[PDB]
């Protein structure tokens, strides 16, 4: 029941790739994401309806943006006046099957919310191991004789007479 993504398509227009394949892609089949009643009353009961969108306040889907090399992007929109298009969501295809393109700040908020919850849960476990005591503290759950100078000096005399030998 969410606008942010469905993956139901029809197998009729999957293998065709052309510039007009997204132009005729408005209401080829029913779909749940394709809004019914006022938006979809132009297709499937009138013929040659593409010139009749403005005379009887029918709503067509967006065909202005179209790329040939990679894939097709179909949209859902609304219009109560001619020469005006305002959408609510974009539905891009990937290898045939559709998906919805979300917003920037919405996915930003839904990702930083999980980030804040993750940081809080990371901070939560740190109290479970450190144990404090006012005296013991914190814990987790798991020379020379001052004659060596002449000792070493005459030992140095021994090193220049018996050196280490390999």
């Amino acid at each position: 029941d969410n606008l942010l993504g469905i993956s139901w398509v029809d197998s009729s227009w999957i293998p065709i790739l052309n510039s007009g394949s997204v132009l005729d892609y408005f209401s080829e089949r029913s779909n749940p994401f394709y809004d019914r009643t006022c938006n979809n009353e132009v297709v499937k009961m009138q013929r040659l309806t593409l010139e009749h969108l403005n005379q009887m306040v029918g709503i067509e889907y967006i065909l202005l943006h179209a790329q040939e090399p990679i894939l097709f992007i179909i949209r859902k929109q609304q219009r109560q006046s001619p020469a005006q298009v305002i959408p609510l969501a974009d539905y891009y295809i990937i290898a045939g099957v559709i998906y919805q393109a979300p917003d920037l700040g919405s996915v930003i908020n839904s990702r930083v919310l999980t980030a804040v919850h993750g940081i809080q849960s990371a901070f939560d476990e740190a109290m479970s191991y450190c144990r404090y005591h006012p005296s013991k503290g914190y814990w987790w759950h798991f020379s020379s004789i001052f004659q060596r100078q002449r000792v070493d000096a005459l030992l140095l005399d021994l090193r220049q007479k018996f050196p280490p030998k390999f």
Binding site: P102, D103, L104, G105, I108, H117, C130
Partner: protein, 157 residues
């Protein structure tokens, strides 16, 4: 015009990434190498600064001088079974292999499972009285906070 208005926010938003990596990559090595000599104020100060400056900077770059949070289009267009080296160039080796499902996985707009129960609670606390008593409570508490800041401003001199 508008594209530069997006850019002036998103460039600093991804500049915050550099500070976050400089924190976490140092934390990763210092946790393994220096697990001992436990100093709870030392890590509490790091947690406090991470809570303070990063959470203020990403908020000030996402909530003001920014494109509207319902405006822009997040579009994935290219994906391949093999490894696309452009992403490992951008992400500096992060998110490897470049699978087919990892591009839908990138746009993980679905929240945690407990978010469903807190939304259930948000539908549950509306069964009792809401926005009628709590509204005047938060109004009186906003006036109380105004009184408190007046007390501080008259006690600061």
């Amino acid at each position: 015009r508008e594209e530069k208005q997006l850019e002036a926010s998103l460039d600093a938003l991804l500049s915050q990434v550099a500070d976050l990596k400089n924190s976490l990559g140092s934390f990763i090595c210092k946790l393994e190498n220096e697990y001992g000599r436990l100093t709870w104020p030392s890590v509490l100060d790091s947690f406090a600064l991470l809570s303070g400056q990063l959470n203020t900077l990403n908020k000030v770059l996402k909530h003001e001088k920014t494109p509207l949070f319902r405006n822009q289009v997040i579009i994935p267009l290219v994906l391949s079974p093999d490894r696309d080296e452009d992403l490992m160039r951008q992400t500096e080796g992060r998110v490897p292999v470049f699978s087919h499902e990892v591009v839908p996985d990138h746009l993980r707009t679905k929240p945690d499972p407990e978010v469903e129960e807190q939304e259930k609670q948000l539908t549950t606390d509306a069964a009792r009285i809401g926005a009628d008593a709590a509204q005047k409570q938060i109004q009186s508490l906003n006036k109380m906070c105004s009184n408190l800041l007046e007390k501080i401003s008259k006690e600061e001199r």
